[PDB]
Structures are given as structure tokens and as C-alpha cells.
Design a protein around this motif. Sequence first.
Motif, PDB file in Angstrom:
ATOM      1  N   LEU G   1      21.526  -3.995 -17.443  1.00  0.00           N
ATOM      2  CA  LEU G   1      21.523  -3.552 -18.868  1.00  0.00           C
ATOM      3  C   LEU G   1      21.017  -2.109 -18.978  1.00  0.00           C
ATOM      4  O   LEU G   1      20.001  -1.759 -18.379  1.00  0.00           O
ATOM      5  N   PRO G   2      21.726  -1.283 -19.749  1.00  0.00           N
ATOM      6  CA  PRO G   2      21.328   0.126 -19.920  1.00  0.00           C
ATOM      7  C   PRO G   2      19.925   0.282 -20.489  1.00  0.00           C
ATOM      8  O   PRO G   2      19.632  -0.149 -21.605  1.00  0.00           O
ATOM      9  N   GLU G   3      19.053   0.912 -19.698  1.00  0.00           N
ATOM     10  CA  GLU G   3      17.667   1.154 -20.091  1.00  0.00           C
ATOM     11  C   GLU G   3      17.594   1.857 -21.442  1.00  0.00           C
ATOM     12  O   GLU G   3      18.246   2.880 -21.667  1.00  0.00           O
ATOM     13  N   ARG G   4      16.790   1.284 -22.340  1.00  0.00           N
ATOM     14  CA  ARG G   4      16.638   1.728 -23.723  1.00  0.00           C
ATOM     15  C   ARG G   4      16.430   3.228 -23.911  1.00  0.00           C
ATOM     16  O   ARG G   4      15.427   3.806 -23.475  1.00  0.00           O
ATOM     17  N   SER G   5      17.419   3.847 -24.560  1.00  0.00           N
ATOM     18  CA  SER G   5      17.476   5.258 -24.944  1.00  0.00           C
ATOM     19  C   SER G   5      16.387   5.720 -25.910  1.00  0.00           C
ATOM     20  O   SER G   5      16.350   5.276 -27.061  1.00  0.00           O
ATOM     21  N   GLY G   6      15.487   6.603 -25.452  1.00  0.00           N
ATOM     22  CA  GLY G   6      14.487   7.187 -26.328  1.00  0.00           C
ATOM     23  C   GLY G   6      14.999   8.473 -26.992  1.00  0.00           C
ATOM     24  O   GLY G   6      16.078   8.973 -26.686  1.00  0.00           O
ATOM     25  N   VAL G   7      14.198   9.004 -27.922  1.00  0.00           N
ATOM     26  CA  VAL G   7      14.545  10.269 -28.568  1.00  0.00           C
ATOM     27  C   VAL G   7      14.633  11.360 -27.512  1.00  0.00           C
ATOM     28  O   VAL G   7      13.715  11.543 -26.703  1.00  0.00           O
ATOM     29  N   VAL G   8      15.741  12.102 -27.527  1.00  0.00           N
ATOM     30  CA  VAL G   8      16.021  13.126 -26.524  1.00  0.00           C
ATOM     31  C   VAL G   8      15.064  14.305 -26.657  1.00  0.00           C
ATOM     32  O   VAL G   8      15.211  15.153 -27.543  1.00  0.00           O
ATOM     33  N   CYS G   9      14.080  14.354 -25.760  1.00  0.00           N
ATOM     34  CA  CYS G   9      13.046  15.384 -25.752  1.00  0.00           C
ATOM     35  C   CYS G   9      12.595  15.589 -24.311  1.00  0.00           C
ATOM     36  O   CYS G   9      12.088  14.654 -23.685  1.00  0.00           O
ATOM     37  N   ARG G  10      12.770  16.804 -23.793  1.00  0.00           N
ATOM     38  CA  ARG G  10      12.402  17.099 -22.410  1.00  0.00           C
ATOM     39  C   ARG G  10      10.880  17.169 -22.286  1.00  0.00           C
ATOM     40  O   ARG G  10      10.237  18.027 -22.897  1.00  0.00           O
ATOM     41  N   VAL G  11      10.322  16.270 -21.471  1.00  0.00           N
ATOM     42  CA  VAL G  11       8.876  16.114 -21.301  1.00  0.00           C
ATOM     43  C   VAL G  11       8.271  17.335 -20.622  1.00  0.00           C
ATOM     44  O   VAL G  11       8.631  17.671 -19.488  1.00  0.00           O
TER      45      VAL G  11
END
Lengths: 131, 101, 115, 151, 66, 149, 27, 35
Positions: G1-11
Motif C-alpha cells: 500500500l502506498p505510504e501516506r502522502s504528507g504535505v510536500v515540504c523539503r525537510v
Amino acid sequence: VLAHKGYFREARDVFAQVREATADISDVWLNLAHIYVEQKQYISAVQMYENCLRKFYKHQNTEVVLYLARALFKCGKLQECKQTLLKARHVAPSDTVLMFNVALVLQRLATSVLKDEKSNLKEVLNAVKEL
Amino acid sequence: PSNKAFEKKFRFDYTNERALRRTLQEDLVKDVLSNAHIQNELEREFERMREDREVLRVIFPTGDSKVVLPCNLLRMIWNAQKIFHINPRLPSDLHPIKVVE
Amino acid sequence: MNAPPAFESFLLFEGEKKITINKDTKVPNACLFTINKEDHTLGNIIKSQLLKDPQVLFAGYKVPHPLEHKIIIRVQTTPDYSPQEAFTNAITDLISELSLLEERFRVAIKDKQEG
Amino acid sequence: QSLETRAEIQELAMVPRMIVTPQSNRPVMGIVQDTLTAVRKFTKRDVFLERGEVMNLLMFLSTWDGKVPQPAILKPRPLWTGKQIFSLIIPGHINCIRTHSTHPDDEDSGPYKHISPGDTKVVVENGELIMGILCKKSLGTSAGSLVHISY
Amino acid sequence: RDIAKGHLKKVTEQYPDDVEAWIELAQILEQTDIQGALSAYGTATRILQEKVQADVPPEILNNVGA
Amino acid sequence: AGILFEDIFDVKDIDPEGKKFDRVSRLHCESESFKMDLILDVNIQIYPVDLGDKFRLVIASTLYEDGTLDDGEYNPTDDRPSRADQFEYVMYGKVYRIEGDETSTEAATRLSAYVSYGGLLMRLQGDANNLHGFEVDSRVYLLMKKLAF
Amino acid sequence: LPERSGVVCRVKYCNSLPDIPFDPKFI
Amino acid sequence: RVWRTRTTILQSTGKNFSKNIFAILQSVKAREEGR
């Protein structure tokens, strides 16, 4: 470096100990807030991003606004998450990462409205056009 | 208390659904919102209190609300809140009909 | 006419124990010690000595009635150390302080007198 | 000189049953004279006792269960407030509110109604003293007095 | 610097008309007590005008501004 | 955990309305990050603090670093690691009132937690999100430390 | 299952250099 | 005269970090060495 190495447990304690001496290093606030997001204490992170924006930026800093949006998403402030990213797109519309995040929040809000049949007509019509 | 202050403090109108969700649970508000008997029970109780009000207004001229009476309900209510740890921050499970009966 | 003779303030009758040990019912490792024919002079020093014991959870004393030549000391200690043995120690060391003080005052005087 | 009489007094005229008078429904015994000024002095917000002092005061409580309450001030070293020690004196779960003699009448009107600056406004909850300083208004032979509620 | 600050303070306390003791104190206070440095430069400004009756040097004004 | 609240506060006013007691004085403090308002009465004799003093305030439900929820008794014999060990000043007491902008039409946005430290009053006035560990009539510790800068 | 997509923000764990202090000069 | 420079801008107002962070490094150094 400990945070990049994944040692957030010590890194948070270090950033906190550095923060005890001074309130003017945003990165210490930001590093603490990031770990608070990673440690799922989203309310504290949101509070740090909101006050960081009001204290250090004379304008809405899209980096902090994005960090805030990431916390707000998890914080259940989907209304504010939407509004924060719409404000962010209003500020930097050519930045495609922020544009993606706006589309993502519209998708996540609609997902909730569309799952439960108790959702009304204005909500569904907004969800359809927003989606 | 004025008629308005009296109603806003002792009527418990069941039409302000928002206040009901603030105060009672969903499994309690549907009776006062849909059951005409339950509404009449409350309307009758408010009328009961209104009639008692007219009575007291003829019992106690000069509006001397301070009186000497058998059981201290005001204190006793508090005593109950502390004995059961009532915590007035959650919606309550006491269906109003339980009170009237 | 009803003055008790002054000796009754300190003289024990036949059978009266100078000290009586009683268990406390309200808490564990706790006793109430009842000294007969005593007053504050002996009780406060013992109380203060008990306050020095790290294994004494509670310690204090009273003279149940000033017209009664009887006092009540209450001692409460850790589970690994009874109030009785605490009392034993609180007697063992308070005596030591007074004995060493006797020796030091005696030498300070002999050094002061003709020296 | 008889049991039928001794019992009758014991069950009808004994002192504790006589704390309150039907004459005025209020108590007729109250904390008075020397101990009342001393308790007022004792209930001030700036009254503190250490364990060496507290353990001396608790020696005079009959109904104390023998368990020391957590001190109101823990560091730099444990300190108990007079009101904290006084909470051990109050039996069971009493719940009462009175106004101290020095209460500014307009102190409840302005802000700090619930956090009185003058430390007036006596408040007893769950058998514990949370606020105020005690005087005749709260400990005397008057209706609503703490002893009246205790009875 | 801390020893100097303590002694210069004593000098200004004994001789409040000593403009130099105040400015030297100000120079140390600039690092740790910006208001203190302002107080010292301001005091030198005031003393020159009222008691020494000499005009105020612009350096004091610049430092007050800084 | 058991940390019901935490922020950095600074003393803005000592008994402005005048000192009624000798060993105790009012502190009108405010926080830096969460923008919390705080009225705190401290034993100014044992722990004298001056105006403008900065202190770290951490309202916790317990003194044990493990957050195991203590029982409210004083015990001089205590072997467990305690937060007070690395903290300077600690008070303890019950919450005797909570107050917010609640209305018959909607819930409060702000929460005001009133706490009595055995007679010493406190009022931590904040928002309805930080005062989440707070529940009326509950034991809590103040765990505060002045910042030595 | 595709790992849950978080808000796109480069850490970014940052350690940003402070602005160079060009504070006004005392005389 | 200016007191805040590129070196002093990096220094704290009064707190010394060495003792605590070196205590933390005592823990971290063991992990970096795989102990």
C-alpha cells in the motif's frame, strides 16, 4: 546533524537547551517545531509557527507558512490549512510545490465531505468544484 | 428576575438545537426536539415555575428573595457536584424528563 | 486542699511505667509513646532529635493536658525501620550529645580555672 | 442518679447535639477569643510551616489520619501554608463559601473576583480550604459559618 | 572590564560632576547596559552645560544616537 | 509525560495594587511563545524575584519524570527521580476554577485556570488549546525556573 | 500500500549564519 | 567601537552549553562507535 542522523530524541533536548539562552534564533524554534510535528504534538508546533510568523516575519514567510500548513494538516485545522495554503498560493503562485499542497488540501477536505452523506449541498457543491 | 431573565434562566427552550448539543447528548436532545410529549412536559414545567413565580410574587411582596427554608438546595447541588466529580465541562447524560419525573 | 503534692509531677506510683508504647491505628510504622510524670523539658529535645532521623516520616509530641503529668510522643517511620527503634536511637544519640557536652564544658572550665 | 434519666440527658441535652440553636437556627458555639485571632493570623497567605513545625501542630488533631499532605511549596525546600495544614483540620468533604471581615465590598465587583487580592473571600471545598482568611464572619456563631456547615 | 565598571561606578558616585568617569563607565556599559551607557553620556551632556558651563561634544550625541 | 503546560514567562509587575503581605507578593507575568497571561503569588521571602525577571514555567500534574501521577501526600522519603531536582521553584495545589468566553450559543476560545497553592493563588489565563491537560479540582505542580540568562 | 502522502515540504534542519553585525559605532 | 562581531554574534548572552552538550555527546559518541 543528530537530527539528520535521525537522533531527534537528543536533538530536541539540545535545541531546547539552546533555546533557553535566546528567543531570536528561528531555526531553533523551527527545529523544535519540526520535532513536535514528528512527535505528533501538532498543537505546540502550530503555536510555534504562528508566533514565529508574527515575531520574525514582516510578511508571511512561505517556508514557515508551509511548515505551519504541514502541522495544521495533522492538527485537524483543515480550515486553516486550506486558508494558509491559499494565502501561500496568493503569495507565491509560481512555486509549484505550494500549488500542489493547495490541491492536496482541497482533496483532503473534499474526502471528508464526500465520505459522509450527512454533508449538505453547499458543502458537496464546493467539494465538487474545489476537487 | 425579570420575565426575560426568568425565561432565559428557567425555561430550557428546546428549539435552540445548538445550545442543546452544547448541554445534552445527541441521544437526549432528539426527544426534546421531536417528542411533543417531552416538549409539553417542559412547557408544563416552565408554566409550573411561572405559576409558582406569580405565587411567590404574591407571597413575598417587597421582593425579599432571601428566605429561611428546610433544605439548602443551592449548597446541596454543589455538594453533589463535588461528591460525583460533576465537572461542568462535558455534555450531561441527565435526560430532562428524568428531572421532571 | 486539692493541690497535688508537687512530687506527683515526677514521681511514678506503683506500676506506672515511665514510658508506654502504643501502636497507631491510623497509619503503618507508627506508634504513640506516652511518658508518665513528664513535661516539655524532656519531650522537645527528643522530638528535635527525631527530626534528625531520615527514616522518621512524622515525629512530634504533646502533653495531653498540662494539669496531667503525662505526655504523648508520636513517631512514624519508614517500612524498614520501626518507630520503636527510632525512639531507641533518638534516646541513644540525645544522651550522647549531652555526655560529650558535659566533657567539653568540664574541660573548658578546667582550662579556664587556673590555666 | 438513674439510668432512665442519664440516658435521657445523654440523648437530648448532650453538648454536640446542642451546637445549633433553634432560637435562630444558627450555631451558638464558635471558634472564639484567643484561638480566633490566632486562626486569622494563622490563615494569612504568608504563613509558612516546615515539617519540624507542622509535625508539632498535627500532634493536636484528633481526627487527623496520620498522613502528611503534600506541601504547598516544594522547592527550594518543603513548606506548608497555614491553610494547607488547616485543610487537615476540616473533616470529611465540607463545601462552603464565606466573606472575610476585611473583604473589600467592591473586590468581587471588579476583576479578581475569583482571585481576591486582599486574600478575603473564604472558600472551603471538598473539606479543604482553598481561599480566604478566617474570622467571626466565617468561624463565628453565625448562619453559614464553617462550623454550621460542619454540623 | 567588570572590575573597571565597578570602580568607575564608584568614581561617578563620589564625583557626579566627573564627566570622564561617566563616559568611561558609558564605554564599558555600551557592552552590557545600553541604557546605562545612555545615562552616562546623557549625564556628561548635562554636567557640561550646567556646572562646567562648556558646550557638549558631538561624540556624546553620536553615542546617544548609536 | 504529565506536563499539562509549559512556556517562558517574564515578571511584568510586583503587587502593583500594593503589598498586602510581607513574605508573599503578586507577580503579573506574561509568556513569550503561546502568549499566555499569568498572575502568580510567590513567597517573596524564600524566593525573591524582581520585576522583569524571566522564568520557565511548566505546569505539570506530577513531580516524577515518568509522569506516573503522584497522590498528593508529602513524603520526605522519596527515592524516585524528580523534575524538581533540576527546577528551582515548585508550588503545588488544586485547580479551583476554570473560566473562558463560553456562551449559551458557543464554547470558549480562551481558558483561565485558577489554582490555589495551598492559599497562594495563581491564574494562568490562556487559550482553549494549551489548557488541555487542565481539569478543575486537580492536583498540579508549577515546576518553574528563573532563566539565569 | 502506498505510504501516506504528507504535505510536500523539503525537510531542512538549519543552522543559518546570523546577519553580519554592522551595528552603529560608539565614539 | 562595536561589541557584536562575526565571532561574538555567535556567542550566548550568559549560558554555557559545553557541559550539557558534552554530556549528550557522551551518549552519542558511544552510538557513533557502535558500543
